UniProtKB/Swiss-Prot annotation, chain B:
Interacts with capsid protein VP0 and capsid protein VP1 to form heterotrimeric protomers. Five protomers subsequently associate to form pentamers which serve as building blocks for the capsid. Interacts with capsid protein VP4 in the mature capsid. Interacts with protein 2C; this interaction may be important for virion morphogenesis. This is Capsid protein VP3. Forms an icosahedral capsid of pseudo T=3 symmetry with capsid proteins VP2 and VP1. The capsid is 300 Angstroms in diameter, composed of 60 copies of each capsid protein and enclosing the viral positive strand RNA genome. The chain holds residues 342 to 576 of 2209 of the full protein. It comes from the Viruses. It is found in: Virion; Host cytoplasm. Transmembrane segments: none annotated.
Swiss-Prot record, chains E, F:
The chain holds residues 599 to 881 of 2209 of the full protein. Disulfide bonds: none annotated. Interacts with capsid protein VP0, and capsid protein VP3 to form heterotrimeric protomers. Five protomers subsequently associate to form pentamers which serve as building blocks for the capsid. Interacts with capsid protein VP2, capsid protein VP3 and capsid protein VP4 following cleavage of capsid protein VP0. Interacts with human PVR. This is Capsid protein VP1. Forms an icosahedral capsid of pseudo T=3 symmetry with capsid proteins VP2 and VP3. The capsid is 300 Angstroms in diameter, composed of 60 copies of each capsid protein and enclosing the viral positive strand RNA genome. Capsid protein VP1 mainly forms the vertices of the capsid. Capsid protein VP1 interacts with host cell receptor PVR to provide virion attachment to target host epithelial cells. Residues 1-21 are annotated as: Disordered. It is found in: Virion; Host cytoplasm. It comes from the Viruses.
Length: 68, 235, 267, 121, 283, 283, 68, 60, 68, 60, 32
């Protein structure tokens, strides 16, 4: 039950027959029954800041006048 | 047993590691989460929120409500600045303590465009035109409208729409700048001047305040987590 | 076309209606409109009481006065509405309660006045105390002023009477009364009443807490802080004054665990 | 600097009672474990130790008779001395710690103390 | 679908403008932040953006472990009179400042917690004596269980409390703990009391501390040296490091600006001036 | 498609010649190197070539780790007066010569960096005292963070700075760091200044060091002995080894020929004679 | 997610039913999420030295006169 | 745990080794490379460039 | 002969492309011949308490009178 | 041998761990279970049984 | 089939009642 994921490669070695190019993956196998024991996946999501930046009831259209 | 060989780094404790470890409370019945309003997914979301700048850090105004108020008046037109500030969001005293600044203090490098928004707080009867400017670094810091006028700028006309935003575009040599005062990665200068002047009719307050706000744009990012100097525990 | 505007609004809840001709739109905190407790998130098992229109209506608290020397004001929810009609009653009769709110702060002047008020709704607005000898010591009475609310101050004055401590908050304005810089408060759901622009602030707040439902008598979910970003000024007058009025309406409030009435020690 | 002040000492006959009090000049945002000590000849002795609340430890001499409380808010501690014995006669002291339920005569500063004299008959 | 490591939006080329569209003008009264991008106020070129916010995700922000307490031990002359050689610390992050401040940007959180223990020891008085490698017992005593009275009483048997026996000189000890809060999330701040003072009751009886609740009562960690008494005194310190993993956070707040003072939000006199001096018209 | 480990080109058999083709004659003025092979000037046989340049690829050239600094500690009599027992070193490769010279054959580079730490300790004054195994804290303080003032201040809590707690006697510590440059590549040389001196400013204000920029400001490593004070003094040394992995390099340069002198390209008098004596007509 | 690559065999053991002959391979599995943690693959490429050896605008034909 | 046995060489630090090691800065946003002119792939490329010989190494 | 089982995930990381969501599994491989050596699976069953709570001969129907 | 690296927690004894361990009596002929009445599967089953409360805890 | 980690039974909504069904009354003598 191995989990193979891809890495986001920053510095590339002069290789495209092993390293650098052909997508570098990494393996993860969980060893414990409790989820709390797992390492962090870091494969996280982002969201639109709107809930904090534009909490207004009537939608904001940037090109138009704020107050109308 | 399986023949194995220990490599360097064995037995070390790197505080930044990400390993599995045995659970001290197996089979614990964890309480499920509820949909609490306001979940944050990334710190930059907080940086995108406008926060007020404490522009006037004079000896008497610092650490008081006054630090936030930039005072304008209906005096005759002048080419002298209303305020001057350095584009050092994490190190200039005026920017360092804003939400943006504070978040920046936990990182070593920053990048992206910023935006300053000014709110005029005078009477409805007061009118005026101001010039907000950003001059990339490398030349004499603008001290006259004449110079400021040459860099990136927005001429703000005071009216029904009470606020104005100037975007400071990401213009830099390096791909990221230092989060400290550094010449090599210096950011430039922000300044505000009177385009015309503030004009009021009779029976109106002749002096009033403007408030400034700073926030990051959608293209802003930070990197290299580090500890902040903004907090300490003596002994 | 028909002339609908962000400035002109009408709010109707229960048997109450509020109109406004100078609004600056309105804020729905964290983009979440108030709602009742979902079955999937429920906790107490007994059938909850939902007062609806009996409690979900606009209640106007006592009016305060803004002058050149005003430092700011604060209130706690549901505390401020503790004595408001059926809402207050339903609150005291039950062990548990949850409620959202529509807070509408009102303050008009003239085209000749100037000033700006920051109206902030802070989740879990814990305020700092007044002692340099004891921490977390503000008493229940002082922590809950009800509809009159409290006030911010410009200077921290430590309570030195160790015989009979005052046991009250000493909230410093620029510190938002909790040791954080005011200039950052904008991270909380808020609006600004800038005299030249608008004469009111409207904040719709959802129920926010670490639990689905909690004790209303012990814990205040939200805190309303109003501070003058820009000071009051009129004509060339040395002592101008304009009133500020709050009207708050609970929304989607439900209560569990009915018993006999809680009679708190408020003084 | 940091100051602790003992009070409540006096002279009583055997079997009597007292209550010693120790408050800090100003609040200390670190010291949460308070202790009591005594001495008569040329050697200090640990009385009782009390952390925030309500874990309280005692010694094999003062247990059952002595009791320590202290406010979980104000950095101060109290010693209730019951069924007092002529052997208890000594100067009592107060000292803040950190997270030290245990006790050892190893404190930096030393206040002043409070004399407790126990009469026989 | 947008992942933390995805590249940010590209800058689109934009030319001159002369219209009724007014991106620059806004009104902060509404409580909204004007969502502008460079192209809204200046002419821009096309830029393929490569930077990402991968290092600023909540998970990555709290990816570092941090100190919380320094527990210590002590051996006297002989017994002389003393046999209370053991440290008991009330588990709370609010003892330091570094981790505490980071955990205050938000109002609530949920996280699995990883604890690592670094143990160091040393000699006291110059002597020719030699101690043998020590074993330590770190015992988690959840709220309720009996707290150790003597260094060698029943409590140390640990029939139900989780305990870690650490041998000196080996890799620092480590364990994981699930989200153990009694609520749907831990409350970094609690605006209220544990007790409602009732009118028909005494003030004393209805009294409690502002901002304190069992929401954060996690119990204690009791640590002792397993080895019996040695003729030569050895002092030991256990540093505890906490790393919040698998974390989620709610409701942003302004970060603490003045020095912390107690487990509450209170502030001390003379620490109220975080800003320095700088003229309004000086760069 | 040509890999580093591929065999070099075979030598083709070639016979006598008498023609207008003139491989031997060239003109170096053009700035080109004449691309000749043996068969161009002599008769050659057919040779199946087996040798490869596998060991001279950039990656393999910098495959060895190298020393950079020697950080040290020290304990006095008692405290007496001193409590500043901790080493702080400004991270820079330009402290030694060996690694530095190798990194100068090129103008720019990009590489993930692996650091290994070898820690050794010893006694000072002959004594019958015995220290217990030590734990060390190697803390990376990126440019900006607060630098430790006392050996036991807040800074050591490390809520965000990466830190390695090394136990003495175990395998040397090791960590990896990504390419962390603020530029598209690190600049081994920088022909310029950090500040432009302006005419309407004082010379002092516009002044800076030639060839210095934040391009190479990486911060510092602060190391301390975690264990508390011991009656017997122990001195410790941490040797840092850097191995540039996953490396790429640009713009070749002539290697340094005279002794290094400072972090710049400067040279000292009396070190300017790298060549020895040898007659023009002596083999 | 294992990466199996071939080794370039130098000294061959007297074996062709295990070692020496039938192509000797080696396995690699990446254990970390960050690419910086990976070992060097060493499977690198070479290039024509021309950019340094013959940086002239008009192509060099060795048999012909350099200057014409 | 999996029964294992340590072989010789365990715990040694060979400066020429090629092992994986934990990253001190996880999820760092690395700056992408640009096409800088003059990349070198092998040292022998530099050896193929003509360089001037200091033939006359007389005392003066 | 690996045994892959699912974990009951309590706290979820902000991930659904690695952690949190798409069912987190864990691997177990037994290394010894004797069953006594195995770790505890914890994958246990529950039962109706009736044998202790309602040990009566004639079935109990809660809505009806106990004694009839 | 397989290159390995020790992580923190190595060598520790967590009383709440769940690991495999060598058997001291290999191939032991264990006695099979019989169907004894009254097996308990969970502690809560016992909590569901009515038990008498000692309501009057007066001094006497 | 009920595993130790399965969620306990949900609470079903129930309204007022007025009937011959007597859940509240019992007789502990039976030993149940
Ligand atoms: C020893 C084994 C138990 C480790 C401690 C686990 C629970 C501690 C909870 C601390 C969480 C916090 O204060 O943030
Ligand atoms: C301790 C953890 C951090 C290790 C140091 C990483 C960054 C140092 C950069 C040095 C690169 C150089 O000077 O060539």
């Amino acid at each position: 039950g191995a989990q193979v994921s891809s890495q986001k490669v920053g510095a590339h070695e002069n290789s495209n027959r092993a390293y650098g190019g052909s997508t570098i993956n990494y393996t993860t196998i969980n060893y414990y029954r409790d989820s709390a024991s797992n390492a962090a996946s870091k494969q996280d999501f982002s969201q639109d800041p709107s809930k904090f930046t534009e909490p207004i009831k009537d939608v904001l259209i940037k090109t138009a006048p704020m107050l109308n | 047993g399986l023949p194995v060989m220990n490599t360097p780094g064995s037995n070390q404790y790197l505080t930044a590691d990400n390993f599995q470890s045995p659970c001290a409370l197996p089979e614990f019945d964890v309480t499920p989460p509820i949909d609490i309003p306001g979940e944050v997914k990334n710190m930059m979301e907080l940086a995108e929120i406008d926060t007020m700048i404490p522009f006037d850090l004079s000896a008497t105004k610092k650490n008081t409500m006054e630090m936030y108020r930039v005072r304008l008046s209906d005096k005759p037109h002048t080419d002298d600045p209303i305020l001057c500030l350095s584009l050092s969001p994490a190190s200039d005293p005026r920017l360092s303590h804003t939400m943006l600044g504070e978040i920046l203090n936990y990182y070593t490098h920053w990048a992206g465009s910023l935006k300053f928004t000014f709110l005029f707080c005078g009477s409805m009867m007061a009118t005026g035109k101001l010039l907000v400017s950003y001059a990339p670094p490398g030349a004499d810091p603008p001290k006259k409208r004449k110079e400021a006028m040459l860099g990136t700028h927005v001429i703000w006309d005071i009216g029904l729409q009470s606020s104005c935003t100037m975007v400071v575009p990401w213009i830099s040599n390096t791909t990221y700048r230092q989060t400290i005062d550094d010449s090599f990665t210096e950011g430039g200068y922000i300044s505000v001047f009177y385009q015309t002047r503030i004009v009021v009719p009779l029976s109106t307050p002749r002096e009033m305040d403007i408030l400034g706000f700073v926030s990051a744009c959608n293209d802003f990012s930070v990197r290299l987590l580090r500890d902040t100097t903004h907090i300490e525990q003596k002994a | 076309a028909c002339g609908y505007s962000d400035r002109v609004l009408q709010l109707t809840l229960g048997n109450s209606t509020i109109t406004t001709q100078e609004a600056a739109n309105s804020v729905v905190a964290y983009g979440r409109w108030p709602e009742y407790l979902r079955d999937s998130e429920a906790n107490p098992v007994d059938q909850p009481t939902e007062p609806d229109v009996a409690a979900c209506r606009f209640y106007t608290l006592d009016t305060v006065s803004w002058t050149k020397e005003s430092r700011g004001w604060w209130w706690k929810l549901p505390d401020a509405l503790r004595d408001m009609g059926l809402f207050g009653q339903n609150m005291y009769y039950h062990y548990l309660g949850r409620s959202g709110y529509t807070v509408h702060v009102q303050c008009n002047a003239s085209k000749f006045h100037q000033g700006a008020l920051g109206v902030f709704a802070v989740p879990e607005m814990c305020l700092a105390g007044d002692s340099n000898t004891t921490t977390m010591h503000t008493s229940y009475q002082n922590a809950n002023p009800g509809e009159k609310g409290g006030t911010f101050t410009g200077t921290f004055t430590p309570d030195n009477n160790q015989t009979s401590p005052a046991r009250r908050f000493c909230p410093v304005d620029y510190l938002l009364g909790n040791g954080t810089l005011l200039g950052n408060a904008f991270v909380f759901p808020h609006q600004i009443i800038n005299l030249r622009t608008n004469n009111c602030a409207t904040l719709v707040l959802p129920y926010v807490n670490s639990l689905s439902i909690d004790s209303m008598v012990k814990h205040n979910n939200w805190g309303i802080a109003i501070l003058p970003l820009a000071p009051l000024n009129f004509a060339s007058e040395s002592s101008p004054e304009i009133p500020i009025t709050l009207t708050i309406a609970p929304m989607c409030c439900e209560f569990n665990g009915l018993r006999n009435i809680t009679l708190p020690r408020l003084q | 600097q940091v100051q602790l002040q003992e009070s409540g000492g006096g002279s009583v006959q055997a079997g009597g009672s007292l209550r010693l009090s120790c408050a800090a000049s100003e609040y200390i945002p670190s010291a949460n474990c308070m202790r009591w000590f005594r001495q008569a000849p040329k050697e200090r002795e640990w009385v009782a130790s009390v952390l925030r609340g309500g874990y309280t430890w005692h010694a094999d001499s003062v247990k059952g008779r002595f009791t320590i409380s202290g406010d979980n808010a104000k950095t101060a501690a109290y010693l209730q001395m019951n069924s007092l014995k002529p052997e208890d006669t000594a100067i009592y002291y107060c000292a803040y710690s950190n997270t030290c339920p245990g006790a050892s005569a190893d404190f930096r500063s030393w206040g002043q103390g409070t004399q407790v004299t126990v009469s026989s008959h | 679908a947008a992942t933390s490591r995805d590249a940010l939006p590209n800058t689109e080329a934009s030319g001159p403008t002369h219209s009724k569209e007014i991106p620059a003008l806004t009104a902060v009264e509404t409580g909204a932040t004007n969502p502008l991008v460079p192209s809204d106020t200046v002419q821009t070129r096309h830029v393929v953006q490569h930077r990402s916010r991968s290092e600023s995700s909540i998970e990555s922000f709290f990816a570092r472990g941090a100190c919380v307490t320094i527990m210590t031990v002590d051996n006297p002359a002989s017994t002389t009179n003393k046999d209370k050689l053991f440290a008991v610390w009330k588990i709370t992050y609010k003892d330091t400042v570094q981790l505490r401040r980071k955990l205050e940007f938000f109002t609530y959180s949920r996280f699995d917690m990883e604890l690592t223990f670094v143990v160091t020891a040393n000699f006291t008085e110059t002597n020719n004596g030699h101690a043998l490698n020590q074993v330590y017992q770190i015992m988690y005593v959840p709220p309720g269980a009996p707290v150790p009275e003597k260094w060698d009483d029943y409590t140390w048997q640990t029939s139900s409390n989780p305990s870690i026996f650490y041998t000196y000189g080996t890799a620092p000890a480590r364990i994981s703990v699930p989200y153990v809060g009694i609520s749907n999330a831990y409350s970094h701040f609690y605006d209220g009391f544990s007790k409602v003072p009732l009118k028909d009751q005494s003030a004393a009886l209805g009294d409690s501390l502002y901002g304190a609740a069992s929401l954060n009562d996690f119990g204690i960690l009791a640590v002792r040296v397993v080895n019996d008494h040695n003729p030569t005194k050895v002092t030991s310190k256990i540093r505890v490091y906490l790393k919040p993993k698998h974390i989620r956070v709610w409701c942003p707040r302004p970060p603490r600006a003045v020095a912390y003072y107690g487990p509450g939000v209170d502030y001390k006199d003379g620490t109220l001036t975080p800003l320095s001096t700088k003229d309004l018209t000086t760069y």
